[PDB]
Scaffold this active site. Sequence first.
Site, short mmCIF file in Angstrom:
data_model
loop_
_atom_site.label_atom_id
_atom_site.label_comp_id
_atom_site.label_asym_id
_atom_site.label_seq_id
_atom_site.Cartn_x
_atom_site.Cartn_y
_atom_site.Cartn_z
N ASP A 206 0.77 -1.31 0.00
CA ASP A 206 0.00 0.00 0.00
C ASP A 206 0.78 1.33 0.00
O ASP A 206 0.19 2.37 0.31
CB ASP A 206 -0.94 -0.02 1.25
N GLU A 230 1.31 -1.71 -5.25
CA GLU A 230 0.00 -1.13 -5.19
C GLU A 230 -0.20 0.32 -5.24
O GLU A 230 -1.31 0.68 -5.67
CB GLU A 230 -0.86 -1.44 -4.04
#
EC number: 3.2.1.1
Length: 478
Positions: A206, A230
């Site tokens: 993330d 990501e």
Amino acid sequence: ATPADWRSQSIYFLLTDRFARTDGSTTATCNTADQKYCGGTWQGIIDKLDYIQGMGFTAIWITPVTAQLPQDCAYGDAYTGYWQTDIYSLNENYGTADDLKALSSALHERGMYLMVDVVANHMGYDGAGSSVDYSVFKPFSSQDYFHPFCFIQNYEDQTQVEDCWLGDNTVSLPDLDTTKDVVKNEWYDWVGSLVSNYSIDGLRIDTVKHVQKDFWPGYNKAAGVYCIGEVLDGDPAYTCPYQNVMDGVLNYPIYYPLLNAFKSTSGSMDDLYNMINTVKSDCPDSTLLGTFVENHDNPRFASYTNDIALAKNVAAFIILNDGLPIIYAGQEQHYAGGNDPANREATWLSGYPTDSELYKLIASANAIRNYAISKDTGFVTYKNPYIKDDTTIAMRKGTDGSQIVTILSNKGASGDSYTLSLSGASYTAGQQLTEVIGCTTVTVGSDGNVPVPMAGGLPRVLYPTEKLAGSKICSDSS
Ligand SMILES: [Ca+2]
């Protein structure tokens, strides 16, 4: 499990609490608007997962893992359950440590793979850095593992984004990385063992982009098993390149324009044909690229145009195209959703209309993909070719042995009976190509200019019909 297999597997994105639930719970209170944990045990997968199989996809993508904080912070909770205010415990809102390795060990046998999405960078704290705690951070106790405090700003720069503080007083995602040996080395050790038992046979980040070049590799290697970074930015020459660092890359850039031209009937397809191209090398591929659509932090594609076609052609090309084609949780049921907090949404909020439109399209079409490889692999590499781009798009993907699938997709749910001739796709004069999903025969003889027969957006992919033996696929009956 690892990099060369992965590449091929269709991706399925979930939450849990919202999704998972042995209870079924057709009517279960949980309206994003009020956030907060919706009593929904992860274990729910062993009773569940028939949801994914019917669709064609082979991977389980679900949320981060731990225990953040217990106190509905104005905002309304971390149920999205990305954060890490403990990393080393293993929640309970979900339901019971052991069971997890168990959910996995289970399916793992049954079929598909395991994708664990991690936010490594930030340790998430209710409060403002000046109100900073430090004691709530195990594996931490001190501040030292975390960083100084400054609001990420002058965005364009890239001389702050990678170190400074990420967030808004209301919440401060506490920045760890003293710049040197400590942090990395540390968190490095961790993952790779977390991996050990519990499953962890594919992993993701993330917090890619703003990391600092070096951390990605170190970690990608800390634990073998394939990774997916990501974070965002979607712009070939930076979003891509990091493909080398990491493994798998977010097709951030791929989506943007697909969103851009898709939605609005006349939209603007050229931006893509030029796009499809940029990536195809600019990124070290090996087919190691990721295809989203909706996007958690985004409003489920549907926020725009309320029509199946514009939806189908997209989702199909995504899957059908280059990269992991990831169908995000609620995609199916056509859940409009909201930019944020109202992106989550108990895929189960209904009793599984398991045969709705999206389900059917996913199942019948995704299958063909997997199928083709099984008898003859190598469809992976095959640089998803732009062949032709007009008012509507058509591309070429696969091997020798008449082992060729060619996909032509158009827009407009209004529809208008559309009959054209596919340009490249270069086949054998007389060769017969099935429609896909719904079925329909395409005759590629005479001149060598393949007749493509469309209705609105159905999407329309032309498969060689000689390489399908006596099996499932299209109109065999089995
Ligand atoms: Ca950082």
